[PDB]
Each structure stands twice: as structure tokens, then as C-alpha cells.
């Protein structure tokens, strides 16, 4: 399947994301209002992907229109990017199982981890700035890119595009914050430490939210939600609980004082022995 | 040296009371008593830990470890 993400306006951008979510995921019964929900990605076989055509970098103009992202459907990872002018798929080393017909596949030495990408890009995501202007620069970098090894500028471009496509699909919070950059004012979106933490906790969140039944709160490691509006304002799409669903153990949640806790978080602060014995037993 | 950076694949309480973690495919032990709950908490939450030691071969000891959120 092919989808467009159109950056022309906040309307076109949010419309694009919503359409993708509707096609690839199903609302949770207990976290859904109108057609705005936390949804679970529908099961697809391993290696299934969808394509995202990038449009509207120049508002409503049919230009800058040769970038396509290949997204593994079950986990929303960007597996690589396609230059549709050269018909070339630059594929990260951790996605050799993703086969795209009709294109020349360039298998890259670079893996898609944020650790690798930030290193090669010399750019940390916390404090990363994204604007319409830097999305155009990112587009140009990706269409100039050639070869099997990610360059600094190509890595910066992927960091920016992954944030405003796949991570925004996952997190309505990132959708809402970034979309201001698309307005006529053209402000800068700055990725926050909270945004970053959300992306790092996506699997854990995905394991916990299917258990939510209207508790007063949800606590998943560093992540806290205090009501359904906070959940819906933050999270849009979760994994179908995939290996990212589980860290250790087999208990998704503990209800404590009408708060739904990730059980591993509670376990990780309830595993201390007597403090006096701890501190004096050096 | 930075010996390993990754999630804790397993931990083990050893007969000599040291504590072993497996990180990035290699096993490392520590006698530092303060680290035992901290390392189990890292394992429980899938924290990325950075094991630093003068030797990095599997079976090396360590006393220095960083606990990261990413």
C-alpha cells in the first residue's frame, strides 16, 4: 500500500497521518473518542511494508516530489528511503528482510538505530530543530545521497523525516507539536526530551495501554498519563502486543491505587533491601 | 575501555556473591555490592547500560557502569 504525507498545511499533514492510521490500525475499545483513538497496528506478516510519498514540502507545489519512505508495517520502522527519480531504494542494514519490487535496492552498511544515526549525523534528537526549511534541506540531501554508507547529511535528513512521519504516526503529541512548523509563520519545532522519551518508550507503552480500563492514571517508566485526554493527546498508534512488547517477565501491569503501572517499573523500585544494610554493606 | 553498551540479557547472582550481567553478547561480573539492585532494575526496565573496564573480554570484571534512558 502507498500513502502520501502532504506537508503543505497543518490540515493536509494531520489529514495524511489520520488516513494512514485508519488504514493500518484498529482503535482500542477503551481509548477511543469519535475517530480519535489509540489504535493497535493490524497484524501483517513479517516483512510487510507500506510506502509513504513525501509531498507538499513547497506548499501545494508539485516539486520536491521524489522522496518515498519504506515503512515496515508491524513496527512503523523506516526501513530506508527511495529516490523515485533514480528508482533507487537505500535500505538500512537491519532491514535486509524488506523486499521492494521494481526498484534497485542498495543495501547499506549503516543500521537504522537512533544511536547510529545520531552518531553519523553528529546531531542529537533532544534539541533537534525541524522546520519546513530543514525538511526541504533534508529532502535535497536524500536525493543527492548515493552509495552504501550513510553520510552525515543523509543521516540528519533521516532523523528529521523519521520524526515527522513514523514518530508522529505513533505519537499525537509529536504530530501536534511539529505541525506548528507548517504554518505560514514557519516557526521551528524543537524536539523535546519528553518527545524523545516517548519514542524510546513506545514498546513499553504498547504493552501497557491494551490493559487500560479507565484507571485514574498510567505509569510506564518515565511516562505518566493522568486521564484519557492526556493519553489521547499523546499516543495515537501502538504495537500489536512483537519483541518490543516485552522486556522481561510476563505481567504487563499492576493496578496500584487506581493507577495502571507497568509491572517492571514497580518491580524496579521494589527490589531494594533494607537501606541501612545496603549502605553499610560496602 | 567502553566494553559493552546494551540491555541486560540476563543477570546472575554468583556463588562468590559477585553479580554477573550479560550485555552485547558478553558476560561481565562485579563485586560492587551497591550495583546489584541497580543492575536488576536496569534489566527489569530494559535500560541501556554501558559497562566500562580495563579489559573487555567476556568474563572480565567491572566496577564502572552507566545507566542510560535511551
Amino acid at each position: 500500500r502507498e500513502f502520501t504525507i502532504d506537508f503543505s498545511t497543518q490540515q493536509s499533514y494531520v489529514s495524511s497521518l489520520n488516513s494512514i492510521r485508519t488504514e493500518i490500525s484498529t482503535p482500542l475499545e477503551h481509548i477511543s473518542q469519535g475517530t480519535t483513538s489509540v489504535s493497535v497496528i493490524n497484524h501483517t506478516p513479517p516483512g510487510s511494508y507500506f510506502a509513504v510519498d513525501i509531498r507538499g514540502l513547497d506548499v501545494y507545489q508539485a516539486r520536491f516530489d521524489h522522496l518515498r519512505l519504506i515503512i515496515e508495517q508491524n513496527n512503523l520502522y523506516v526501513a530506508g528511503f527511495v529516490n523515485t527519480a533514480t528508482n533507487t531504494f537505500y535500505r538500512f542494514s537491519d532491514f535486509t528482510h524488506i523486499s521492494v519490487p521494481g526498484v534497485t535496492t542498495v543495501s547499506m552498511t549503516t543500521d537504522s538505530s537512533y544511536t547510529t544515526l545520531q552518531r553519523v549525523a553528529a546531531l542529537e534528537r533532544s534539541g533537534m530543530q525541524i522546520s519546513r526549511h530543514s525538511l526541504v534541506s533534508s529532502y535535497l540531501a536524500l536525493m543527492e545521497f548515493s552509495g552504501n554508507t550513510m553520510t552525515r547529511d543523509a543521516s540528519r535528513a533521516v532523523l528529521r523525516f523519521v520524526t515527522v512521519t513514523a514518530e508522529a504516526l505513533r505519537f499525537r503529541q509529536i504530530q501536534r507539536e511539529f505541525r506548528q512548523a507548517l504554518s505560514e509563520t514557519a516557526p521551528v519545532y524543537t524536539m523535546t526530551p519528553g518527545d524523545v522519551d516517548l519514542t524510546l518508550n513506545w514498546g513499553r507503552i504498547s504493552n501497557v495501554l491494551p490493559e487500560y480500563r479507565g484507571e485514574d492514571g498510567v505509569r510506564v517508566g518515565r511516562i505518566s498519563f493522568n486521564n484519557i485526554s492526556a493519553i489521547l493527546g499523546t499516543v495515537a498508534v501502538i504495537l500489536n502486543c512483537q519483541p518490543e512488547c516485552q522486556i522481561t517477565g510476563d505481567r504487563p501491569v499492576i493496578k496500584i491505587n487506581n493507577t495502571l503501572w507497568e509491572s517492571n517499573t514497580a518491580a524496579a523500585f521494589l527490589n531494594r533491601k533494607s537501606q541501612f544494610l545496603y549502605t553499610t554493606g560496602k | 575501555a567502553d566494553c559493552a553498551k546494551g540491555k541486560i540479557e540476563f543477570s546472575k547472582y554468583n556463588e562468590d556473591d559477585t553479580f554477573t550481567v550479560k550485555v552485547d553478547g558478553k558476560e561481565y561480573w562485579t563485586s560492587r555490592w551497591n550495583l546489584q539492585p541497580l543492575l536488576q532494575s536496569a534489566q527489569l526496565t530494559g535500560m541501556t547500560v554501558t559497562i566500562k573496564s580495563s579489559t573487555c573480554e567476556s568474563g572480565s570484571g567491572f566496577a564502572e557502569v552507566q545507566f542510560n534512558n535511551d
Partner: peptide
């Protein structure tokens, strides 16, 4: 395994 993009 560290978070993939």
C-alpha cells in the same frame, strides 16, 4: 536491542 528508526 536499541531503538530503531
Amino acid at each position: 536491542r536499541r531503538r530503531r528508526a
